[PDB]
């Protein structure tokens, strides 16, 4: 149930091409050879068999730069001894597991002891061990693979660490990995698609940037051997400190990440995906990057399946297919010509302007043809004459016939070329294609893909659909792939050849299609022939200028740019949507639908990401009349062409939210280090009488720059009255707005858009579709913003959370779910130069702008965000959201924490890649207690400041802060208004006498306590006093608190309204406990009396804890500690009773309710076993009063141990702290130990008492080791 590991760090030589260099464990005769090949310095992790770090275990070449692979399971432990032997210090942050702050790998605004901080930097020599828990919650879920992809690395400096090569491998399986893993089968190869950059490595001081796969560029990776007809598990771990992505294809295979078909393996910064694939073939294959930007010429490696010796249940394939139907697959009848025509990218043009964006790309002139171009399509014909065309249609131009096929069906694709050049026809995603009739190849044609059909040929292709290229019962009915030519991929693509492919399952029949294409006419074979025909001048010349190219990169929707495609669908009607992104593009498209919500991986989303050369299938229900545009979400597009609209048209209570849009002045980091800037936000208000912006506190203080929670269940209503302040006009769009069917006549473009200082109300019924699925969580996240300029005013500051809770779950008057502390995170980049309010930001007197880039979570930077505080064993529901441009592909990570997400199934994650626009919900429950960090794991974001700390605390650490005994010293107490000789220091609870509390005649009085340190606070015990007969006290009061000097804010916890009114005492002697679930974090705290009785008098005590939650009852009183762990030197044993050492529990009662030594003397003692190693901050002692004989211990020393024979007494100042104890039977006495001690066995020795030695106890402590 434990495993042992050893490891260090070493600097060496590495080249990215030739192997055999990663074996410097025995010196070789290779030093003369200092010739191109190219070499740098790189540093990595190195394994060692033993504990003296000299026996260097060898490694295989397929790993490459990967640190030694590490394994564990549930109910386990992991003991790893790191030792830096290189130059720079290294750490060891981990993901997926469980550690105790003594093992993190990063130091931040943690307010923690430095003993728990040396793990944050391991420096050369030395050692420093770590240990990880892999506890209950970290285990894998059901529909999860047998094992899960996680990792580790040094976190001392992210930008330099990952680019110097500090990285490793760390899978974690469940109880079920001990089995003899079939050594000639499973194999389980580990891959790293890392982007490396020596230009900001550790050691470097215009350097080269590199796309490697485990460290190998240009098809240089050996060692990849998997068996024949048996699958293999891909443990992919994307890196790259730069953002960017890698749409990764395997030459002739698909993938089985999760439960859906995947041609591409779309990775992004720090992804953690586990694919599976079947190796049905023999021979050698390639795995390359299919990005249009061929800087990625390195992301290519070699794969060879081979034969083996002699299918055990290891998630044996699950795409089961057989017979639940009736009819047979039909051989299909298709005739396709690749002939030539001319194309208008906007047959509905207009406006011959100049300043227009639609002039460069479209307006025909004497030197820019803009509008019409000569291309080459895939035309559909009815027979073999190829001289009668199948009815071509609008709303699917420039493209070829729809090509449909079930599993096992047959497609007879007959191809005739009627063009000036040889073109091909070839499908994607399908793994089975050969000529009809024959099996074998032409002449020297190693693979049919890139074989040209001559201008006149007639070739008979036979496509057949297997299963290992289709659905899984999980994904939608018909995944989407493409077909076109292959003899010149990029150019044939830009020439005009394109066509659709569909693979369905049985158990306008299939509707219309959409291709998002960047048609690069500038590489068409009909470039030098498009001039000689269309342009009025020949010797144009001088085209090397970068706006002749941007005069015809026709950013098109199908074959139509600038609102030229106008398809039509009625109301209520249901439409599948097969979407694709093929073209130049280079990157991914964040497509969206104005006022429409669609279903993706059987989940509901607002925006859908589209990788290059990636088919994604969706479907949406049409129940929103009007006229709706499309879009791209990714910046300079749309402007440049990509539009097309839709013209839909026809053929218990309610929750009220008064919202406006004001403009504050924001500063992201007053901490650390300052200019203050001007943005525009939303704020919850009170009335249309817009005077009282409802104050956001406690439950809404993490929000900061975000708009307010607008909560709503399903089947109720959502009224959004929205008045607009500000200067420029903005709006309120949701994609959940559902205007009723109004104004027939013709389809009207939806108005929205309110001029400043004007009001518009929104009122729509929440439908079931906006709600979360039965399979989903309790409350799905939705986006909402302003639709006036969805890019600029989004960098200005208008965004918020629209939450749709499900069923009768958002209860009470509070309008929250209350069973869960729910938070919202917003990972994006802010660039003030696009803001509407940037001109006025010349805030100085009288040139690179790199400090206007704010990598800001919720608008904070470098731990500056406060308001993240969650209960211990509570379930928390996080909401991650990414927006902006395509740089925002954030890898969200909670320091050491693991979370769960639901998309049809419930999987498990530690880092989330937040693709922009998509809004997904996650949940988690935290175990370890303290303050942790929330980061975006992208290297160049942590140092740019994208980070904030979040505290989890103890819900059962209540210790008197010190008002009583005097732990709270006398100078800490202050107040204004004091009447006369009723001093604020007399406010100590249970203190009577002549004068005995603190009063004040004055009206607006208060009283201040300084805790000297940022302390956690868990409640206030409020009393009063008596002057002869009149009971005086506080009947009603409210709370103030601060943190540094004068950032004072009120207490509005547990919603209620404006702020929480506390109820005071009622009598003199009577005590009142005003707890608060939502606790306070402060050090200065003031109380304000609102309704006294005669005079504001007060006798009090504060209930609190330290910032790391160490003052916990371990289990003495609550009987969580077993008696077999509680003994002594003896025990008063006889017949009247027995005072067993197991009877000395604080507050434990009985006729024999204590421990008593059989002989009284200053030698006796009592001992406690913990069976593990724990931390202790104090003891609490308590005597007993049997009969009329009071029995307690007046003084006691304390000694500690790790074993059971050797003891080290508790010292202080110079000698041993004689802890003074009880003076009565009842009242317990705390003695907070200082310093705290890490221990396993604890002893207590008396030195003096009363009558006879007797005691009950409870130990303030906390978990550790």
């Amino acid at each position, epitope marked *: 149930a434990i495993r042992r590991y050893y490891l260090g760090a070493v600097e060496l030589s590495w080249d990215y091409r030739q192997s055999e260099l990663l074996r410097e464990l025995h010196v070789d005769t290779r030093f003369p050879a200092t010739a191109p090949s190219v070499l740098y310095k790189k540093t990595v992790f190195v394994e060692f068999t033993d504990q003296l770090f000299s026996v260097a275990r060898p490694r295989p070449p397929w790993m490459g730069l990967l640190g030694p692979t590490i394994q564990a399971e549930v109910y386990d432990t992991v003991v790893v001894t790191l030792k830096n032997m290189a130059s720079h210090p290294v750490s060891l942050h981990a993901v997926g597991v469980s550690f105790w702050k003594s093992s993190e790998g990063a130091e931040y605004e943690d307010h923690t002891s430095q003993r728990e901080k040396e793990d944050d930097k391991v420096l050369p020599g030395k050692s420093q061990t770590y240990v990880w828990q892999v506890l209950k919650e970290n285990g894998p879920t059901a529909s999860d693979p047998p094992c899960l992809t996680y990792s580790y690395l040094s976190h001392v400096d992210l930008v330099k660490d990952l680019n110097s090569g500090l990285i490793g491998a760390l899978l974690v399986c469940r109880e079920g990995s001990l089995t003899r893993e079939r050594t000639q089968n499973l194999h389980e190869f580990v891959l790293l698609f890392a982007v490396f950059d020596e230009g900001k490595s550790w050691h470097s001081a215009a350097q080269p940037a590199m796309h490697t796969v485990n460290g190998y560029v240009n098809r240089s990776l050996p060692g990849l051997i998997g068996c024949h007809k048996k699958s293999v598990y891909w443990h992919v771990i994307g890196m790259g400190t730069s953002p960017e992505v890698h749409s990764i294809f395997l030459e002739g295979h698909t993938f089985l990440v999760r439960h859906h078909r995947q041609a591409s393996l779309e990775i992004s910064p720090l992804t953690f995906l586990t694919a599976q694939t079947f190796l049905m073939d023999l021979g050698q294959f390639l795995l390359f990057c299919h990005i249009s930007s061929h800087h990625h010429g390195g992301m290519e490696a070699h794969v060879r399946v081979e034969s083996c010796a002699e299918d055990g249940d290891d998630v044996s394939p699950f795409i089961q297919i057989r017979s639940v139907a009736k009819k047979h697959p039909k051989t299909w009848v298709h005739y396709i010509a690749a002939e030539e025509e001319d194309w208008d990218y906007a047959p509905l043009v207009l406006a011959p302007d100049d300043r227009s964006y639609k002039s460069q790309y479209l307006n025909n002139g004497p030197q820019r043809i803009g509008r019409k171009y000569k291309k080459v399509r895939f035309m559909a014909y009815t027979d073999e004459t190829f001289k009668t065309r199948e009815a071509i249609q609008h709303e699917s131009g420039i493209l070829g016939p729809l090509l449909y096929g079930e599993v096992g069906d047959t497609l007879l694709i007959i191809f005739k070329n009627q063009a000036s050049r040889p073109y091909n026809i070839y499908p994607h995603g399908i793994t089975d294609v050969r000529p009809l009739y024959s099996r074998r190849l032409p002449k020297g044609v190693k693979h049919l893909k890139d074989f040209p059909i001559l201008p006149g040929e007639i070739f008979k292709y036979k496509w057949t659909v297997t299963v290992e290229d289709g659905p899984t019962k999980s994904d939608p009915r018909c995944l989407t792939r493409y077909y076109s030519s292959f003899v010149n991929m990029e150019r044939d693509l830009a020439s005009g050849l394109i066509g659709p492919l569909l693979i369905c399952y049985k158990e306008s029949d299939k509707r219309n299609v959409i291709l998002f294409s960047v048609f690069d006419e500038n590489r068409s074979w009909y470039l030098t022939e498009n001039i000689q025909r269309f342009l009025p001048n020949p010797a144009g010349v001088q085209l090397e200028d970068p706006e002749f190219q941007a005069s015809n990169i026709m950013h098109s929707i199908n074959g139509y740019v600038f609102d030229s495609l106008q398809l039509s669908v009625c109301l209520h009607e249901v439409a599948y949507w097969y979407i694709l992104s093929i073209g130049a593009q280079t990157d991914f498209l964040s497509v969206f639908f104005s006022g429409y919500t669609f279903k993706h991986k059987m989940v509901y989303e607002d925006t859908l990401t589209l990788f290059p050369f990636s088919g994604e299938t969706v479907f949406m229900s049409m129940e929103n009349p009007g006229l709706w545009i499309l879009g791209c979400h990714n910046s300079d597009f749309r402007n440049r062409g990509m539009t097309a609209l839709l013209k839909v048209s026809s053929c218990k209570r309610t929750r009220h939210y008064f919202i406006a849009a004001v403009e504050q002045l924001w500063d992201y980091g007053m901490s650390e280090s300052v200019p203050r800037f001007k943005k525009v936000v939303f704020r919850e208000f009170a009335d249309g*009488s817009f005077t009282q912006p409802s104050y956001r506190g406690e439950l809404n203080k993490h929000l900061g720059l975000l708009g307010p929670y607008i909560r709503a269940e399903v089947e109720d209503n959502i009224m959004v009255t929205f008045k607009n302040q500000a200067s420029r006009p903005y709006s309120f769009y949701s994609s959940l707005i559902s205007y009723p069917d109004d104004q027939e006549q013709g389809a009207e473009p939806r108005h929205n858009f309110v001029q400043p200082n004007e009001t518009r109300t929104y009122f729509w019924k929440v439908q079931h579709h906006m709600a979360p699925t039965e399979d989903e969580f309790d409350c799905k996240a939705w986006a909402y913003f302003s639709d006036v300029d969805l890019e600029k005013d989004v960098h200005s500051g208008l965004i918020g959370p629209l939450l749709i809770c499900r069923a009768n779950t958002l209860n009470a008057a509070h309008g929250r779910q209350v069973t869960v502390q729910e938070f919202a995170l917003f990972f994006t980049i802010f660039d003030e130069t696009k803001s509407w309010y940037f001109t006025e930001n010349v805030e100085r007197n009288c040139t690179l702008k790199e400090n206007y880039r704010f990598h800001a979570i919720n608008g904070y930077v470098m731990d500056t965000l406060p308001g993240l505080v969650m209960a211990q064993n509570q379930r928390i529901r996080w909401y991650l959201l990414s927006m902006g441009s395509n740089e925002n592909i954030h890898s969200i990570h909670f320091s050491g924490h693991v979370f769960s997400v639901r998309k049809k199934e419930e999987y498990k994650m530690a880092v989330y890649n937040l693709y922009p626009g998509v809004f997904e919900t996650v949940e988690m429950l935290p175990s370890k207690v303290g303050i942790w960090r929330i980061e975006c794991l992208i290297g160049e974001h942590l140092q740019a400041g994208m980070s904030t700390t979040f505290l989890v605390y103890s819900k059962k650490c209540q210790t008197p802060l010190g008002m009583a005994s005097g732990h709270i010293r006398d100078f800490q107490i202050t107040a204004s208004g004091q009447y006369g000789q009723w001093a604020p220091k007399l406010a100590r609870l249970h203190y009577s006498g002549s004068i005995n509390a603190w009063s004040t005649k004055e009206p607006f009085s*208060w009283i201040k306590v300084d805790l000297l340190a940022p302390m956690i606070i868990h409640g206030i015990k409020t009393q009063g006093a008596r002057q002869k007969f009149s009971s005086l006290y506080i009947s009603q009061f409210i709370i103030m608190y601060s943190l540094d000097g004068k950032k004072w804010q009120t207490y509005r916890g547990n919603s209620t309204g404006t702020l929480m009114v506390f109820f005071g005492n009622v009598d003199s002697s009577g005590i009142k406990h005003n707890i608060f679930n939502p606790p306070i974090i402060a050090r200065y705290i003031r109380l304000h009396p609102t309704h006294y009785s005669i005079r504001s008098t007060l006798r009090m005590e504060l209930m609190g804890c330290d910032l790391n939650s160490c003052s916990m009852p371990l289990g003495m009183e609550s009987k969580a500690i077993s008696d077999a762990q509680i003994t002594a030197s003896s025990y008063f044993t006889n017949m009247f009773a027995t005072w067993s050492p197991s009877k000395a529990r604080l507050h434990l009662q009985g006729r024999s309710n204590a421990w008593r030594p059989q002989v009284n003397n200053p030698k006796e003692w009592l001992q406690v076993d913990f069976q593990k190693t724990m931390k202790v901050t104090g003891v609490t002692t308590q005597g007993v009063k049997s009969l009329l004989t009071s029995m307690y211990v007046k003084e006691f020393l304390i000694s500690s141990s790790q074993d059971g024979h050797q003891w080290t007494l508790f010292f202080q100042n110079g000698k041993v702290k004689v802890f003074q104890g009880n003076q009565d039977s009842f009242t317990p006495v705390v003695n907070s130990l200082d310093p705290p001690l890490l221990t396993r066995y604890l002893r207590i020795h008396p030195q003096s008492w009363v009558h006879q030695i007797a005691l009950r106890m409870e130990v303030l402590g906390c978990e550790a080791q």
Partner: antibody
Amino acid sequence: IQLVQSGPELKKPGETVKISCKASGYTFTDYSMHWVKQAPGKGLKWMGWINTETGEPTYADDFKGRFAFSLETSASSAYLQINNLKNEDTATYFCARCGNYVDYAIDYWGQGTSVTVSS
Amino acid sequence: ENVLTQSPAIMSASLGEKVTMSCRATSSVNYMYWYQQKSDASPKLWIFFTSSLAPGVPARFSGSGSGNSYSLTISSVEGEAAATYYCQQFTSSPFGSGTKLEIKA
């Protein structure tokens, strides 16, 4: 603990006039401060306030373009430097406090000042 | 814009008669305050936080409420406490005080 203001002045339609408001016997810098307008008729009309921790005042709506609120940390006092004194500025101007924290109200007052519109 | 209306204007009281005066306001508030001007004097704090009384007021006074209509009740009025009364609020900006209110015994 009192607010000792200055005695009233006398000006002509549209000039410059500076008052005062010396403190009591406490830490003046911590506390806030308002000025009040009280015409020979209406109950009250608010003028504004100033967070006198380091000096960052505000204004009301009725009154704009022809007033001022300054500071003197030395003698613990606030000022009201009214420019472009129109004729109907004829009312009693006061001094407030609100306390040091939650919901700013009023604590003490003082003597007045008003010599408008004077011929 | 935060308007407070004082109700009534000036009433004819009686030396020992349960008399109350409201102060309803368009914009609704949480906490209310009152002040007495003793015939154009430097005004005085009388009720603070909705209902409780300040130090230095004959206990014959009270009054309370919440939201859109507050009140100021007096049990036994006496010619001593016969002056002018304004209500003033603090929930926004500006803090427009009430109109007018007076006592005649």
